[PDB]
Symmetry: D2
Subunit: 141 residues, 4 copies
């Protein structure tokens, strides 16, 4: 699968290379039911005009990583998972190198899963944290 997203269905409405994710280059490294990690190389496509990594990039990386780590478990159970809320706090700017994300599952309820995502730069500093609440619902189709 492109970007290493979990391969859980035969076809997807939008190919990975055309999505926001494939455009900026998000890649999943490890993925388990309780923990997943992903990273992205910073290029201008991830920056805003003042030269820092965009606020939206940290949110998008957290959202994809936490939701897909959820999809990877629940999809075969006949469920979908979508992001329901995201709370992100920005501690230090990233200007270049990579952003690495580590998502840790802190609650798995029957309707809601909750993941804490830490976003670090190449020196290992904590630049942002992003909490994701993921809704889990029976598939429609």
């Amino acid at each position: 699968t492109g970007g290493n997203l979990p391969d859980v269905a035969s076809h997807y409405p939008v190919a990975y290379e055309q999505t926001l994710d494939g455009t900026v280059g998000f890649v999943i490294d490890e993925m388990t039911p309780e923990r997943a990690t992903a990273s992205v190389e910073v290029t201008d496509t991830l920056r805003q005009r003042w030269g820092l990594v965009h606020g939206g990039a940290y949110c998008a990386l957290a959202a994809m990583l936490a939701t897909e780590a959820t999809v990877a478990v629940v999809h075969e159970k006949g469920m979908m998972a979508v992001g329901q809320s995201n709370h992100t706090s920005f501690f230090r700017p990233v200007k270049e190198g990579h952003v690495r994300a580590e998502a840790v599952r802190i609650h798995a309820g029957s309707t809601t899963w909750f993941w804490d995502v830490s976003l670090r730069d190449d020196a290992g500093r904590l630049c942002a944290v992003s909490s994701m609440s993921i809704a889990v619902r029976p598939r429609r189709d």
Copy 2:
């Protein structure tokens, strides 16, 4: 260039190469208390399941709120940056546009706070995103 506020003579990254230029955000109106922006939905704004990406609502809110604060404080020697964002997703968007309206609710000496509503073509509320914006002295 997106109609972002033109406050400086040079910018490190050109608008068309930024995340904002890549997905196509454009500012429509901008005043100190209220700003609006919009974007057409294309695959670049979607995730693999075909819905507008969670990141895209957050990106829009953050650019709009922060640049609407830049518009006011830059000429005063201040920089403005997003410090936190809280986004809640009520209804997905599949196609058409996403239209954002940011309303300034607090303007403190060190922090401004904006509420950003994000609506689809039918005018339905699809997400809200609160942005807290830190305002600090420019570093020379």
Copy 3:
């Protein structure tokens, strides 16, 4: 009903005057399905040791007001409503007088309702805002 909370059941596990709400003195003024208002007189019981209204008081008032405004609609439909998340931002301290809250319903989904609560002082200044997400689930008993 004590504090003017919606009267939706014959008996409640804890009487109003013994609850956190009745202890600090929260009172509901208006209540509709899309809008509710409440207030509280500030006394030391609502303050922290440095003399300001406690952070917890703004959250508690928002949580009670948004959840009960939800209970008032859904209870007779056989549902319960509980607070699922709360995000509060504090703009200006309140030292005395009253805190008045106005909750406005911004989304009513089939599993989740979302209320924005503004908290003002007696001069009408906006001192805090508190977003409440309320989960709505079938009753257990």
Copy 4:
């Protein structure tokens, strides 16, 4: 008096009369990077349905995070106050205790950020509450 940090000679409100003294919060450990507190559940901490009040988790997180920051910055001429709190409720608590553990995750010059886990007697995670704490020069 709750074991709060004793940083000043006089406090405007005595601990037993504060919201914190009224519901019974007590600090157990406090270091610059980590603090713990607990409270017994009584009706005063509950809402009318018999569950611990949403406000009670938020109150606990906010007092603990802020006072753990006071402990460090007060002697440096700074005051600390809660600037935002985000609390998510995973499982209700009906009786027993609520035990809070606050871990400092960022300590910036103007903002500190703490994550506070709130657990019941069985040690289950019932809520988490992130606290952002503004740190500013004391006003004389």
